[PDB]
Structure 1
Amino acid sequence: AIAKMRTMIEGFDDISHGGLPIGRSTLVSGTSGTGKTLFSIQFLYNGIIEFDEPGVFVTFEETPQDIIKNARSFGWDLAKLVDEGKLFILDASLSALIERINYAIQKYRARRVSIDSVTSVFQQYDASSVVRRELFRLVARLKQIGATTVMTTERIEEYGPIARYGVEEFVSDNVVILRNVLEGERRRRTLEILKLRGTSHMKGEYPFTITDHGINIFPLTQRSSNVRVSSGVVRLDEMCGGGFFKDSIILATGATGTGKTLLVSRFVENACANKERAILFAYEESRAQLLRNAYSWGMDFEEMERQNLLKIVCAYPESAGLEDHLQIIKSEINDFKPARIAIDSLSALARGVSNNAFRQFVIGVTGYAKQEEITGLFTNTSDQFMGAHSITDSHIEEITDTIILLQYVEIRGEMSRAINVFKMRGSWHDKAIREFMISDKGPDIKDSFRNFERIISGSPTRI
């Protein structure tokens, strides 16, 4: 096996199966604005913070003052690290460069080296053979010195050659690719480990986000128990065999206006009533509209929000990508430590996105909720309000544990509502589909449609 230096970057050590190999060069290639400089800075910063390993950052484009000023936005005080001698910033804006880097490593006992852009040096030569030869010389000398080095290079096209000259991949022992894919006028950041000589790794592209704390890569044994939480509606708990499970994931799917937001609001209100903290992520309604609707339902969200029990986070789905929404949800969960989380609509997050990306987002959110033992209440909007046979437009049914189905039923020329417990993993539940009503006091559950047939199609026939 090969010893691996943990980069301590969130999620990178998972895909790399223990981190970057010790003493081997890693080349991170990407287009402008992908996060190469941030990756190289965070490598050294996390190394210094977690293991006291000195770092040397050799820069070519940005001045050291610019590097420190940019890092200050992340809370990283690189200036005090330079004063303490833990971090060194070499200015290089090839043999002499390697000699100076070696001298810096010797003087500061550096364990990690970062090279901001070797491409700027290679700009002086047009032949790819010369670039390959000089990169091989640099990598060989770095390996001989024994310092783990992370160099970054530039790309012209997202889906094309891995590097500018097409020969950098064949030289470096380790290759990592940062991509900023523009599709549907939306930008998505992806990370892909192309080649790790001598060790296994995860294969493919995984989304990552840049936040105030740096890079947060999402590298896509959950515990279970018999403790049952209360949804908030007594009939909905009786139908579920004694309420939802603590670790369960509940998905309430139905057409617009069937009462998904009402169930979400009752879930949050019941969470806060038992002195538990709850988070409500809203994507179809604003905070004031939610307050007015809750007041129409006889529920005071203002009092529970003043007590810091309920946190309502409202944003438009189009304001950020799905991975950004996942990162925001995770950050809010970490900051607030909630017992329950609810989402106003997954279909709102599903607007204008591919099925695979939405499924990945749902899998990530549900896995994080189960890992943190947080009761999650997701909701989904069906495209057709009657005659729908697919539970969800994007198949996420297998992911969830408990499913609630809300639908419209046309009876006597009136649009009544029907609610049913579609499935519950590990628990008995009522199979009947029952009439669902909404009034000033909230939701009510009535008897089932025993006298009707073809109820699922939305246009039943009395028999």
Structure 2
Amino acid sequence: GIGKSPTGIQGFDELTLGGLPTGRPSLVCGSAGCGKTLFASTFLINGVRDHGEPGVFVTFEERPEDIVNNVASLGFELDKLIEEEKIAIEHIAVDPSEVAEIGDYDLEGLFLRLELAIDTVGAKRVVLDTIESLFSAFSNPAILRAEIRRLFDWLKERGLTTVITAERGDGALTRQGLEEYVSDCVILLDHRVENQISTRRLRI
């Protein structure tokens, strides 16, 4: 059928019969501490290690050193890979005035930058982390869905295997309730407490 990209998490590749879709964005949704950032980090690192696929980690919130240190204890030599020019961490910051309203951000400007980052390492996998900063501004349901579709279409045009991390908030899957209806793969990570015992759970 469709092509798939292995994540390196054996047991999720078996469930997905090969991995995440090749050339289409994927959405990993969860609350705080559910592991949806480690998922993307593992995706990128295993892709670069097992298949020679350079990766890009676009972050709108965290700093590159924080991202590098957050996975040091897991054994990922992320600093090595960054030194070897096989992964690039890109920080696209937004100021308070920047994020005030709808259409305030020039998405084509973002598209130009993301292109620069991709062509630096010749990326074949991308992670967009904390896109909530940009899209929490939009306050009309239709305009927001149009912008999200614009971004997803731009990502799909390039043929880049993308993983987008989304925050559940008070929603079933996503805070604003629209990204899950635009993507092709949706993965929910959950951390529930029962009788004082917490369990990590995963669902496609």
Give TM-score scaled by structure 2 length: 0.89
After TM superposition, the structure 1 = structure 2 runs for residues 47-446 of structure 1, keeping only pairs within 5 Å, are 47-93=47-93, 94-157=107-170, 160-193=171-204
1:21 aligns with 2:32: no
Unaligned runs of 5+ residues in structure 1 are: 194-463
Q: Give me the CA root mean square deviation.
A: 1.3
Q: Is the 8 A contact 1:56 1:114 kept in 2?
A: yes
Residue matched to 2:104: none
Kindly report structure 1 stretches of 4+ aligned residues shifted beyond 6 Å: none
CA deviations on 1:10-44 (whole Å, 9 max, x unpaired) are 31101111111110110111101101111111100
Offset of residue 122 of structure 1? 1.1
Offset of residue 154 of structure 1? 0.3
Q: Which amino acid aligns with 2:177?
A: G
Whole-Å separation in 2 of the counterparts to 1:16 and 1:119: 27
CA deviations on 1:38-97 (whole Å, 9 max, x unpaired) are 111110000011011100001122110101111111111211211111000000133322
CA deviations on 1:343-372 (whole Å, 9 max, x unpaired) are xxxxxxxxxxxxxxxxxxxxxxxxxxxxxx
Give TM-score scaled by structure 1 length: 0.40
Offset of residue 119 of structure 1? 1.6
Offset of residue 129 of structure 1? 2.2
Whole-Å separation in 1 of the counterparts to 2:31 and 2:138: 20
Whole-Å separation in 2 of the counterparts to 1:174 and 1:131: 20
Offset of residue 128 of structure 1? 2.7
Unaligned runs of 5+ residues in structure 2 are: 94-106
Offset of residue 132 of structure 1? 1.5
Whole-Å separation in 1 of the counterparts to 2:193 and 2:136: 27
Offset of residue 175 of structure 1? 0.9
Whole-Å separation in 2 of the counterparts to 1:107 and 1:137: 24
Q: Which amino acid aligns with 1:58?
A: V
Q: Is the 8 A contact 1:27 1:150 kept in 2?
A: yes
Of the two structures, which has the highest relative contact order with CA contacts closer than 8 Å and spacing of 6 or more? 2
Q: Is the 8 A contact 1:36 1:116 kept in 2?
A: no
Whole-Å separation in 2 of the counterparts to 1:113 and 1:169: 19
Whole-Å separation in 1 of the counterparts to 2:184 and 2:83: 33
Whole-Å separation in 2 of the counterparts to 1:134 and 1:33: 28
Whole-Å separation in 2 of the counterparts to 1:96 and 1:41: 25
Q: 1:182 to 1:101 in 2, by over 3 A?
A: same
Q: Is the 8 A contact 2:61 2:91 kept in 1?
A: no
**Counterpart secondary structure, 2:162:** strand
Instruction: Give aligned pairs, total.
Output: 191
Q: Which amino acid aligns with 1:12?
A: F
Greater strand share, 1 or 2? 1
CA deviations on 1:176-225 (whole Å, 9 max, x unpaired) are 111111222221111111xxxxxxxxxxxxxxxxxxxxxxxxxxxxxxxx
Whole-Å separation in 2 of the counterparts to 1:99 and 1:181: 40
Q: Which amino acid aligns with 1:175?
A: V
Greater helix share, 1 or 2? 2
Whole-Å separation in 2 of the counterparts to 1:135 and 1:173: 13
The structure with the larger Rg is 1
CA deviations on 1:362-388 (whole Å, 9 max, x unpaired) are xxxxxxxxxxxxxxxxxxxxxxxxxxx
Identity of aligned residues (%): 45
